[PDB]
């Protein structure tokens, strides 16, 4: 399995998210409704994306902090495979979300932990023990040793790690030799002259490095 290419749809309206998704959909592995977009338009976007892409992985990036079973159910019934919980969510909250998405989506339903602020590696092990083994790591605000070592360490622990922030066809090589699960890209690709060509070039660079 090569690293996945994920497109983040972080648009402030429905037409922007749908247009971007359709423009790049055939060239990516994972299509994500980003939190900015969901807060604007609600979960019907998820259902529209599922209908357009029956076999693709679909992410509802809700960054759930509470009401885990409810939010997870609301998005799984729309067709999501993966849902994010914010790292400050409690273990009971994340477990409720995991159980609800697995209940509706036994084949692919998973929670991903969104990594923000001062999280710890003991916390991270608690996520693993809760049955949750995906985490989303963000570039500090290019990909220095401090960030890559945290990524490598999360990988050693047993996480499938997604990385996001400052990703381009040109910076992918910085991750050579690291077993990154998914690279999340956004406007770098969807705002390109040729979005599908940009998505393709990006995945072709993943092929060159990991293939």
Residues 79-108 that bind a copy of itself (CB under 8 A): 86-90, 92
Q: Smallest distance from the beta carbon of 74 to a copy of itself, in angstroms? A: 6
| Chain centroid offset of residue 80 CA | 12
Q: Are 189 and 198 in contact (CB under 8 A)?
A: yes
Radius of gyration of the chain from its Cα atoms, rounded to whole angstroms? 16
Q: Are 202 and 169 in contact (CB under 8 A)?
A: yes
| 38 contributes a contact to a copy of itself by CB under 8 A | yes
Q: Smallest distance from the beta carbon of 141 to a copy of itself, in angstroms? A: 7
Interface residue with a copy of itself among 19, 47, 56, 66 (CB under 8 A) is 66
Q: Which stretch binds a copy of itself (CB under 8 A): 30-38, 51-59, 142-150, 203-211?
A: 30-38
**Residues placed in the known binding site for Mg(2+):** 32, 61, 114
Identify the CA nearest to 89 among candidates 47, 48, 57, 130.
Answer: 130
| 179 contributes a contact to a copy of itself by CB under 8 A | no
| 117 contributes a contact to a copy of itself by CB under 8 A | yes
| 34 contributes a contact to Mg ion by CB under 5 A | yes
| 186 contributes a contact to Mg ion by CB under 5 A | no
| 30 contributes a contact to Mg ion by CB under 5 A | no
Q: How many residues bind a copy of itself (CB under 8 A)?
A: 32
Within 8 A by CB and 6+ apart from 50, the residues are: 58, 78, 79, 80
| 12 contributes a contact to a copy of itself by CB under 8 A | yes
Q: Which stretch binds a copy of itself (CB under 8 A): 49-57, 70-78, 145-153, 172-180?
A: 70-78
Query: Which of a copy of itself, Mg ion, none interacts with 75 (beta carbon under 5 to 8 A by kind)?
Result: a copy of itself
Within 8 A by CB and 6+ apart from 53, the residues are: 21, 25, 31
Q: Is 143 left (phi over 0), alpha (psi -120 to 50) or beta?
A: left
| 2 contributes a contact to a copy of itself by CB under 8 A | no
- Measured between alpha carbons, how far is 33 from 44 in angstroms, rounded to an integer? 10
Burial class (CB in 10 A: 0-12, 13-18, 19+), 166: middle
What the block records as the tokens of 137 is 């790591």
For a copy of itself, the binding residues (CB under 8 A) are 10, 12, 35-36, 38-43, 62-63, 65-67, 70-71, 74-75, 86-90, 92, 114, 116-119, 123, 141
């Amino acid at each position: 399995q090569l690293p996945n290419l994920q497109v983040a749809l972080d648009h402030s309206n429905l037409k922007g998210a749908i247009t971007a998704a359709v423009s790049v959909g055939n060239e990516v592995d994972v299509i994500e409704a980003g939190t900015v977009c969901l807060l604007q338009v609600g979960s019907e976007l998820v259902e529209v994306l599922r209908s357009l892409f029956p076999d693709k992985i679909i992410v509802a990036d809700t960054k759930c902090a509470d009401a885990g079973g409810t939010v997870a159910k609301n998005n799984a019934v729309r067709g999501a495979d993966w849902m994010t919980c914010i790292c400050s969510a409690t273990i009971p909250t994340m477990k409720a979300a995991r159980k609800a998405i697995e209940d509706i989506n036994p084949d692919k339903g998973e929670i991903q932990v969104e990594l923000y602020g001062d999280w710890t590696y003991d916390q991270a092990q608690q996520w693993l023990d809760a049955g949750i083994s995906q985490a989303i790591y963000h570039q500090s605000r290019t990909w220095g040793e401090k960030d890559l070592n945290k990524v490598k360490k999360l990988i050693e622990m047993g996480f499938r790690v997604s990385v996001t922030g400052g990703l381009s066809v040109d910076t992918l090589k910085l991750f050579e030799g690291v077993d990154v699960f998914t690279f999340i890209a956004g406007r770098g690709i969807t705002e390109a002259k040729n979005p599908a060509g940009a998505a393709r070039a990006f995945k072709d660079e993943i092929k060159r490095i990991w293939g």
